[PDB]
Amino acid sequence: GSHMTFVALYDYESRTETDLSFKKGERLQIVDWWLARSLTTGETGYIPSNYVAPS
Numbered sequence: 001g002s003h004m005t006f007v008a009l010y011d012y013e014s015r016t017e018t019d020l021s022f023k024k025g026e027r028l029q030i031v032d033w034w035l036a037r038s039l040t041t042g043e044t045g046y047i048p049s050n051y052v053a054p055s
């Protein structure tokens with residue numbers, strides 16, 4: 001109901017073709033690794049869920 005929007009707690013650099021880089025403070029909408037869309041870049045890929053918190 002609002003539990004699909006998150007904010008990055010830490011920077012993260014992509015390792016693979018399927019993960020998504022992000023910066024601390026970047027917000028992510030969810031579509032241990034979650035499929036997300038960056039609300040900064042619109043790119044969609046997997047993120048480590050422990051790197052983000054509810055926003």
Ligand SMILES: COC[C@H]1O[C@@H]2O[C@H]3[C@H](O)[C@@H](OC)[C@@H](O[C@H]4[C@H](O)[C@@H](O)[C@@H](O[C@H]5[C@H](O)[C@@H](O)[C@@H](O[C@H]6[C@H](OC)[C@@H](O)[C@@H](O[C@H]7[C@H](OC)[C@@H](OC)[C@@H](O[C@H]8[C@H](O)[C@@H](OC)[C@@H](O[C@H]1[C@H](O)[C@H]2OC)O[C@@H]8CO)O[C@@H]7CO)O[C@@H]6CO)O[C@@H]5CO)O[C@@H]4CO)O[C@@H]3CO
Pocket residue numbers: 039040041042043
């Ligand atoms: C450009 O100005 C016209 C535009 O102005 C208003 O849009 C605002 C928007 O409201 C505002 O949002 C709050 C912000 O937008 C930001 C996004 O919200 C944010 O997610 C991110 O956006 C990302 C996208 O998510 C990514 O997908 C990607 O987009 C690039 C596309 O990749 C898929 C790429 O194809 C290319 O887009 C083309 C587009 O191709 C699909 C093409 O469509 C025909 C054309 O878009 C038209 C559009 O159809 C038309 O709609 C009426 C209008 O759009 C206006 C909005 O209506 C208005 O909303 C209030 O004009 C567009 C331009 O003519 O052209 C596109 C551009 O080439 O390129 C995409 C950009 O790289 O990447 C982006 C960026 O990371 O960031 C957005 C801000 O950058 O700002 C908007 C204006 O900038």
Ligand code: NI
Pocket residue numbers: 001002003004
């Ligand atoms: Ni929710």
